[PDB]
Design a protein around this ligand. Structure first.
Ligand code: CL
Ligand code: CL
Ligand code: CL
Lengths: 146, 21, 146, 20
């Protein structure tokens, strides 16, 4: 389709430069500091999780038709008795692991759905707590450069 | 089995939350 | 600034999932496979460059008034006697190094300018060669790992 | 200065191309 080649090249440029800037430490915007601190905290959460247990989502049997119900049950229980930044990192790590299992077991259709379920839960049920506890700036203060 | 998973996530999240302060 | 409007919670989710999937080696789209292949080629190229030579970032003097002429001079000579994928990787790594040096020396305004220079050179002068040589999917065949 | 850099980019580019 008209213009698709040009647009894709622009996205490669943007993606390459953002990768290199964040790779060397430079956070050039606000959500850039949040993303970088979230990626780092997710890697640390996964490292601590694997040292104590088996890897995430092993023993979780996901299929496309049942995945939503499992996601909904895990996330509701994770935040049942409260929210804190550590549990929010767990929420992200869980979704990441769900997507990895999905691609690994050849259910790639689930990836963009899991992203929608996470964003919905994030906006509906975590953003009010986030706003009342300093916003994403506070998260960056607590987990950035880690 | 999904019961056990969210408990592992919650306790690991809380350990993280503590050590971040 | 680079990444002007990727500020939503939805994009934070998409960004984290994308980081986890590519960290474990999985691509959710053809475009994702190109981006991953290009980031890793850049990492590998710059490592080989730093061992044979100085830092790619131990650079010539960048200023806002001379950055384009430096860029144009280097790029035109890079492709004067022909194009191949290795030189296209070198072209991305060079732009990335200009951006890093620009931010490091407090000329952040140049990042978006360099991004335009790269997209413009790519779309006007490399895109014909890319199409005659199997497109970016052939790059992934040759430089992807998985 | 820039003649030197682009020579290093080109020869590193070509070696990487040959190896892939
Ligand atoms: Cl957005
Ligand atoms: Cl990514
Ligand atoms: Cl993508």
């Amino acid at each position: 389709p008209l213009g698709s080649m040009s647009q894709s090249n622009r996205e490669l440029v943007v993606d390459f430069l953002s990768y290199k800037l964040s790779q060397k430490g430079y956070s050039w915007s606000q959500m850039a500091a949040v993303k970088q601190a979230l990626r780092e905290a997710g890697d640390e959460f996964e490292l601590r999780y694997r040292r104590a247990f088996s890897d995430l989502t092993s023993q979780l049997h996901i299929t496309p038709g049942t995945a939503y119900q499992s996601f909904e049950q895990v996330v509701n229980e994770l935040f049942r008795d409260g929210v804190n930044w550590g549990r929010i990192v767990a929420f992200f790590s869980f979704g990441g692991a769900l997507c990895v299992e999905s691609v690994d077991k050849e259910m790639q259709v689930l990836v963009s759905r899991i992203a929608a379920w996470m964003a919905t839960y994030l906006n509906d049920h975590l953003e009010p707590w986030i706003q009342e506890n300093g916003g994403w700036d506070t998260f960056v203060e607590l987990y950035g450069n880690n | 089995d999904m019961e056990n998973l969210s408990r592992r996530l919650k306790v690991t999240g809380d350990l993280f939350d503590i050590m971040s302060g």
